[PDB]
């Protein structure tokens, strides 16, 4: 899938 | 996929 | 897929 | 892919 | 690909 | 301040 | 000051 | 101040 | 001020 | 001030 | 402020 | 402010 | 302000 | 201000 | 302002 | 069925 | 089915 | 199925 | 299927 | 199939 680090307040569907 | 760092806020389908 | 740091707000299909 | 350093903002399909 | 630093704002299909 | 609805995910200094 | 909305994964210093 | 309505990802001073 | 629909990614000072 | 619709990832002083 | 008949599942500044 | 009849789903300033 | 009838999903500034 | 039918997912500043 | 019928995914300023 | 996230003020009929 | 992130207003059959 | 990110006001049959 | 970003107003049959 | 960014008022088969 995506790779994301410290991401602030998001919405992911993954 | 896609390789984020740090990311302010966002939406990710993934 | 794309490569991205310090991204505002945004959104990512990946 | 693309390759995006501090990108304000955006969409990304990637 | 495209190659892009300090982006505003824009839309990238990568 | 500023006057805000439904916000997503953000950051605000306020 | 401004006033938004349905803001996505913004800043506001505010 | 600004009147903004469905901002995507944005920075505002405000 | 300014009168803005649906603006993507921006910044705006405000 | 300005009017605006749909504005692409731009940069408004306002 | 605003006044309003058979808006469904909205968001108001007013 | 705004006057209104069966909308859906919107955003709305006022 | 704004008179709307069966608008679908909108957004409004008014 | 405007006045609307049957429009489908637009967006207004009106 | 604007009258509308029918009017399909537009953006409106009116 | 259908995945959605952070729909607003939505009508699903699943 | 379909895969929607921050669908704003909308109707969905499903 | 479809892929829809920020999908604005819209309807979908899925 | 299709992949879509930040679209404004549409239809999708999907 | 299609791949979108930041379509305006569409309709989409997909």
Do not use: D, T
């Given at each position: 899938?995506a ?12």
């Open positions: 899938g790779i994301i680090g410290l991401m602030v307040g998001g919405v992911v569907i993954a």
